[PDB]
Design a protein around this ligand. Structure first.
Ligand SMILES: Nc1ncnc2c1ncn2[C@@H]1O[C@H](COP(=O)(O)OP(=O)(O)OP(=O)(O)O)[C@@H](O)[C@H]1O
Ligand SMILES: Nc1ncnc2c1ncn2[C@@H]1O[C@H](COP(=O)(O)OP(=O)(O)OP(=O)(O)O)[C@@H](O)[C@H]1O
Ligand SMILES: Nc1ncnc2c1ncn2[C@@H]1O[C@H](COP(=O)(O)OP(=O)(O)OP(=O)(O)O)[C@@H](O)[C@H]1O
Ligand SMILES: [K+]
Ligand SMILES: [K+]
Ligand SMILES: [K+]
Ligand SMILES: [Mg+2]
Ligand SMILES: [Mg+2]
Ligand SMILES: [Mg+2]
Lengths: 527, 527, 527
């Protein structure tokens, strides 16, 4: 394949043109006053979206040289989306700013590698300052405010998320599905999440979602590994006799048993799924007992009152109404166990919580209580047509991800003012030479970009707004939706720290490497 | 694939051009004085229709940017057709008006999201007013008037529909079929409608209507799911040797059996279709044995006197005269079961009705007896050629859908006067800011469109007609066919409330979302 | 697929151009002085024809808009050909006239739907007048005149058809085959025709005609349905032993026996065909025993002196010289029954004719006598080459269809004067408004077209001929072949009523619907 080679400023200009095009397309959706982007779909209706990485991933350019910058910005946005789940537009605009400054600061005597090192040093200092200034979340009002801010100022989504996390706890399970009505509905379904996926992908019974879903499934628990075929055949016979699916939760399944299960499922049609038993040692036995009590079943392989898998009986297996299994996790939703046994187990765990003072035991008992009690939550998004339902689902997912991020770590000022207050942290750095000084100055100039973009999207002059923000007190910022300078914390314009630091880190790490190029090699287009 | 990105007013202008073209094509058919549209068919004679969604779905534009607006208006029309079954042209014209106003009201300082929120609020207020103004239907004359109005003023269609619903009840089953004479006639045929769609879309054997039509097909039943390939091979062999279609009524069809069926149908040509079994548990078995007696077949998989699917022999399966299957519902009309067993099960059901007094059991038994006794009504339309028969079928289907809608809910003034009287309901709203006020004004101006279009199609000026209507009393409207201001209720120009509110809701919900776009991304054309 | 949309007079002009082209091509063949059309055939010699439907079906235009009008006129011609079997050119010219008038009478204030309604009312009135003016056929001279007029003035064909219907009765069976000589021949073959097709397409033993032909076949009759395989296996054994084809005529054949017959015919090669038993109840038994005595066989399953099927013997099966069976009907020509039973049964049928006086029994006995006595008649068309043989066969088929139509219903004046005398019938109609009056006027102007076209093809001025005709008495018309005004009834220029009313109805029904169009949607041609 013949190739074309470009040298010097021409390649930089072409790649900067590509980066500018992609970032200008992306940045129109930033802020409370941003607008949407319509993307043509080949198989049906066009998709209307406000999500930054969704816009970034859908732009490919005919030119070979601009496509390089487009792909690099796409990489920035995708990394930011995967690591944090939010703040892709901020990463895109920061990447464009850093790339433009780096391209403009290249001369014959300049050393781009030392500029990259200085940029990395400044970014590390800013991240340290951000972590120092962070504060934790303690009240449900903060959760509601975070959810509302992340959902483009929709208060109903924030209230729904806050109520869901009240009902299922701060570490509960929340799932988003498309609805069939005009309003949003929240349903609380009992269940557990034991952080174990399926052993073999042959158990998948659907083509969409890549999950194994069974209804009214039998529960099979074994403390020890399943090796003998005769220890599992009667269970399969019982499951087939009742025409009900079977769920196998043991320590491990060897090759012979797994092959037999796969062959029976593919040929006969038995709905059998085997997963790894969660926990280790004592915790594994405790959690097996927990599911046995919850589903009304029993634990096989235990030393005390040992019950063998060979003489398995229908009454020795628990019943679960619905099972959902994926490659990362699996859930059993509604068991059929007696309430008395569940109450006894809960009381025993509560008593054991007050017996010993240790992090490990207390955390394990709290996890067991949460699994046995909280359950899962499902959110249904309503609307009239598919496009608006999809857009609302995107906003709800972004709000959920941002709320989880703000629960894991602390929160900072929103509206782009968090990065502005970290500029004085760059005054404590001592560059080793001129190039590190150039990099530090590039980062210092770049740190003002998010606030300027948010102000510009609102129809005002960003420079004056940023200058006024920097001259006010530490708690005063700009309210773009209202157009007034207000107390950010009191008005509830707050953002997670994780999203901000992740976006800054990814943008800097990719753009600084991009700005060190001298030669670009691309393939000649074919006919 | 390379993509093209457009910014600002260019994309909006192109999308508006596409929307204007599609809506101008659609709107010529609205009103009693509307005209028809000829759509070319690639496999035969051209199709002449007066139906709005049929015209809308058949317009695709070469330009990539106008096609987005075309697809969005097509989605509006399709949603209106699926939810209500009538009023697609009204939805199309309202959508065009809202889109044009929204595109005209976008400026640098405007916030389209708040405009959309205001539009939604105004639409909700108007819908509440419409629900308040509605009145129910009490006499068959109102039904005849509704059917006549919905059928483009054809009194014979209204009379025949009124007679049919008198004979089979207001909540019966009515079907439309091709006639072989010059006139329309009504016949009563016993049958059942079990309310289930088809498993796979590959079973469609027709080009028009998106349905599955077989004649003189056998019936296969299975209480349990069909999984093994060999459990279904003898039935397929029987269907092939007997050279007649086959119908499978199973709990579910897994991937292997479905793949075998679709490959056999595509390669050999067997007319086989599988649909989901209606009901659950005991009701499921009751309905399956319902249809077993109705067809004279047998129920497979039952615990008592179990009969396997592997040894199926033709007297173990029933026969039906004709099969109608669509994605939502399916029916089998003329079974071949003997009368004695049907009667004996009828008396056992009426006896079971007298055994227990409970809502669930009584409702299930009433549904079963209605299915086994009342039967369906078939309408046959007359004509000399296929084109006029198809046009009359479209009009009769629209009339039936509108009659059902006006039976479920109330009726309002026709001719577009229902929305005009709801304009004062918008004067009690207090917008939160300028943008919500702009949205409310957009909706207020849009509410006059249907009456103006109906008047314009009649060859007069719509503005003067609307102005004179708004200055008259509450019960006075414009008769487009006669050209006189008359009492709508006395003259019988009335519309269902459900159709009006559905059309308005879908039109607003899609057009307001469309009017918030800033960037359009389309794929570059290929060679 | 990209599509093109046209509005207003452009689409109407294009469709009118297409209609004018097709009708101008068709109309040159109308009348006694019409000319022929040569149509290219891709696989051999060109086809020379004078039939209107054949010419219409072979014109396809490159332009997408003219092709719509072409297809509509083709639909008119095909419907007229399928319904009456004659008068396709009249339908084509009437359709063109109505379409042209309707396109000319469209303005801003016009309502085409009311115009269509007025057209339908006018057509109904004209058809009622035509039915009033009809008179029946009573003499062979009228039949000869009808056949001669329909055969383009060929007296030999008329004489042959008159002789054939004299020999085999007015409700006899006449078939046309290719001849191998220079002259036309009529041959009389005894036989019976029971109006029943065969059960399964698998019995076809040829590629041309889609009919099953056996020679020197056995006859098996069963009063009841054949269910047991052992009740039929000896029949195939006897048929294979004598190496003769077998024809089975039973009430019905179940799936098992049909599959066995198909398998044996495909693998072994036995010439067996299954057909349905004609007649219902007593009539079925009477037909079965009549064909049994005609073929010298016996009827199995009769209650009195029951003869079983499992012990079937060669002498129990009738013998027939040859069998012709198709989808719609089947023929048994040369049975081997003894003359004594046939003559005897003739005597008892004649006796029971005079025993009771009832329309049902008298009709059944008359059909039984016709089947047992008349037989069939075959017409062989002679010529030197294939082209002129095909043209003569087309004319003979047209004459046969017209003669059958004139036997079923009455006759009216020919030469297009039948429609002229119905113009005053339109003066008694009172239109509801202006548009219905416009439609009535359109029909009134259209009614003069056939006479004008016939006169125009003769080389004279049609307007003067029509004006002179309307000023003469009721029985005076124009003789286009001789150029004189003569008494049409005396000279034998007469036409069937069915052909005229069918052509008028079809042409009006399609053209009036066509004239209401406003928008035309066509696909962009692909390179
Ligand atoms: N009312 C408001 N006034 C000022 N700033 C606001 C207001 N509401 C939100 N913001 C800020 O605007 C930003 C919201 O941007 P947005 O959610 O569109 O994009 P993002 O965080 O880069 O990621 P994504 O596109 O994936 O959602 C955040 O920095 C948030 O703090
Ligand atoms: N004689 C009449 N005078 C005034 N208004 C009328 C008259 N007849 C019908 N209308 C009104 O005109 C409208 C009829 O619309 P039309 O039948 O063209 O299509 P639609 O309801 O939008 O749906 P679709 O095309 O799917 O059938 C209704 O609002 C009806 O109330
Ligand atoms: N000698 C005649 N003088 C005047 N009119 C005649 C004479 N012979 C026949 N006609 C009339 O001319 C017409 C014959 O038309 P022609 O046979 O060309 O076609 P057609 O009946 O329209 O149908 P097709 O083309 O399918 O055979 C009839 O209306 C018939 O009454
Ligand atoms: K965004
Ligand atoms: K319409
Ligand atoms: K002709
Ligand atoms: Mg965000
Ligand atoms: Mg309608
Ligand atoms: Mg003729």
């Amino acid at each position: 394949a013949a190739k074309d080679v470009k040298f010097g400023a021409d390649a930089r200009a072409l790649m900067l043109q590509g980066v500018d095009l992609l970032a200008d397309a992306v940045a129109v959706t930033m802020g409370p006053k941003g607008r949407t982007v319509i993307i043509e779909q080949s198989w049906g209706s066009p998709k209307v979206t406000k999500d930054g990485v969704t816009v970034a991933k859908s732009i490919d350019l005919k030119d070979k040289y601009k496509n390089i910058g487009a792909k690099l910005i796409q990489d920035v946005a995708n990394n930011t989306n995967e690591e944090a789940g939010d703040g892709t537009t901020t990463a895109t605009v920061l990447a464009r700013s850093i790339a433009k400054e780096g391209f403009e600061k290249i001369s014959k005597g300049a050393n781009p590698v030392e500029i990259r090192r200085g940029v990395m040093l400044a970014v590390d200092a800013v991240i340290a300052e951000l972590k120092k200034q962070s504060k934790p979340v303690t009240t449900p009002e903060e959760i509601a405010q975070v959810a509302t801010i992340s959902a483009n100022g929709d208060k109903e989504i924030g209230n729904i998320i806050s109520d869901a996390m009240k009902k299922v706890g701060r570490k509960g399970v929340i799932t988003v599905k498309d609805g069939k009505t005009l309003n949003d509905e929240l349903e609380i379904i009992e269940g557990m999440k034991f952080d174990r996926g399926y052993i073999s992908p042959y158990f998948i019974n659907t083509s969409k979602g890549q999950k194994c879903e069974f209804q009214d499934a039998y529960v099979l628990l074994s403390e020890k590994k399943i090796s003998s075929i005769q220890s599992i055949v009667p269970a399969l016979e019982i499951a087939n006799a009742h025409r009900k699916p079977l769920v196998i939760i043991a320590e491990d399944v060897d090759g012979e048993a797994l092959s037999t299960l796969v062959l029976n499922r593919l040929k006969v049609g038995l709905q059998v799924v085997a997963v790894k038993a969660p926990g280790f040692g004592d915790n594994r036995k405790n959690q097996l007992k927990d599911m046995a009590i919850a589903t009304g079943g029993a634990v096989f392989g235990e030393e005390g009152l040992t019950l063998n898998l060979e003489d398995v009986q229908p009454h020795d297996l628990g019943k679960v109404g619905e099972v959902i299994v994926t490659k990362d996790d699996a859930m059993l939703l509604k068991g059929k166990g007696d309430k008395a046994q569940i109450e006894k187990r809960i009381q025993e765990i509560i008593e054991q919580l007050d017996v010993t003072t240790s992090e490990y035991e207390k955390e394990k008992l709290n996890e067991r209580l949460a699994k046995l009690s909280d359950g899962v939550a499902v959110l249904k998004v309503g609307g009239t047509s598919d496009v608006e339902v999809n857009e609302k689902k995107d906003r709800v997912t972004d709000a959920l991800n941002a709320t989880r991020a703000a629960v894991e770590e602390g929160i900072v000022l929103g509206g782009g003012c968090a990065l502005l207050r970290c500029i004085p942290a760059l005054d404590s750095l001592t560059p080793a030479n001129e190039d590190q000084k150039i990099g530090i100055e590039i980062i210092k100039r770049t740190l003002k970009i998010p606030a300027m973009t948010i102000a510009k999207n609102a129809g005002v002059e960003g420079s004056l707004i940023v200058e006024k923000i920097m001259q006010s007190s530490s708690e005063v910022g700009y309210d773009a939706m209202a157009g007034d300078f207000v107390n950010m914390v009191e008005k509830g314009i707050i953002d997670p720290t994780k999203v901000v630091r992740t976006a800054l880190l990814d943008a800097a790490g990719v753009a600084s490497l991009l700005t060190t190029a001298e030669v670009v090699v691309t393939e000649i287009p074919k006919e």
